[PDB]
């Protein structure tokens, strides 16, 4: 009879790809959350453990919004579920879509839905803000950020911004955007002659040191055939935020 061996090979390859995506997003989102939690004297070590009881999520939302949220002080699983729900309800009231993200999943440390929760928070508070000169009417925020990126790198020889994945892998785009903003910070001759990892490392270093932009991304995770789109968008948005 049938033995499912192709199915198992597809499962192995597919799970490998999804696990790698989760791993890279986990790093990005942990660093992003910590950029804000530090303002509340809090810090995440493990994104799949340290949001389970709801307290860091509530604090994250308080920092991002400037609002005061309710908070359960009880220590049992009942209270953790309630506590997480406080954060979800805050977001739902603000029309934030949280498809399939339940208080149980966050309290259980579910990787996909915990990552998904931070992504919707990043989208709502940071990425959704953008407006760009030249933007069309029903352009999404993502589309506006892509347009902004495209405008910033016009005039640079051989650079293309077609997407938020492969276009960014070799680090040239990140350097060109910083150079457009403050040309004294970037030697484009070096950029054109350097390896992908050198370019990525340098762009991230300059943006942190000189523009105050948190290094969210590790060069080794970006210099790959298919960079993580959510991770790229989060960081590019952060570059935009630092460039008035």
């Amino acid at each position: 009879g049938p033995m499912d061996n192709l199915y198992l090979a597809v499962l192995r390859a597919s799970e490998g790809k999804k696990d790698e995506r989760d791993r890279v997003q986990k790093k990005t989102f942990t660093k992003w959350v910590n950029k804000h939690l530090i303002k509340a004297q809090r810090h995440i070590s493990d994104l799949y453990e340290d949001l389970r009881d709801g307290h860091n999520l509530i604090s994250l939302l308080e920092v991002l919004s400037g609002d005061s949220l309710p908070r359960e002080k009880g220590r049992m699983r009942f209270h953790k579920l309630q506590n997480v729900q406080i954060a979800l309800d805050y977001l739902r009231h603000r029309q934030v879509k949280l498809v399939n993200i339940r208080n149980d999943d966050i309290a259980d440390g579910n990787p996909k839905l915990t990552l998904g929760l931070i992504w919707t928070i990043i989208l709502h508070f940071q990425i959704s803000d953008i407006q760009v000169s030249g933007q069309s009417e029903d352009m999404t925020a993502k589309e506006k950020l892509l347009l902004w990126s495209q405008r910033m790198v016009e005039g640079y020889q051989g650079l293309r911004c077609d997407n938020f994945t492969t276009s960014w892998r070799d680090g040239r785009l990140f350097n060109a955007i910083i150079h457009r903003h403050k040309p004294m910070l970037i030697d484009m001759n070096k950029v054109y002659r350097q390896t992908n990892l050198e370019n990525l490392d340098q762009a991230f270093s300059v943006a942190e040191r000189d523009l105050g932009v948190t290094r969210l991304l590790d060069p080794e995770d970006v210099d790959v055939p298919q960079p993580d789109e959510k991770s790229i968008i989060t960081y590019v948005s952060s570059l935009y935020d630092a460039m008035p």
């Binding site: 033995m3 192709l6 390859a13 597919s14 490998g16």
Partner: protein, 65 residues
């Protein structure tokens, strides 16, 4: 669905909408496995509904359902 299409594209190296034994073996070797030619053909045959020797996306979908 998009998830299944991403998974299919992991195997469909030349993007011709079909997976061959060579494409299958390529992925499996990239994941540390070392299947034989006969093993590869057996794997494809099992879900090769129309018998043409390769797996297209509809056959892939049937398998993964």
């Amino acid at each position: 669905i998009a998830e299944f299409k991403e998974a299919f594209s992991l195997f469909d190296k030349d993007g011709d909408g079909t997976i061959t034994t060579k494409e299958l073996g390529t992925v499996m070797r990239s994941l540390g496995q070392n299947p034989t030619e006969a093993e590869l053909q057996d794997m494809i045959n099992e879900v090769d509904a129309d018998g043409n020797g390769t797996i297209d996306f509809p056959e892939f979908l049937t398998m993964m359902a």
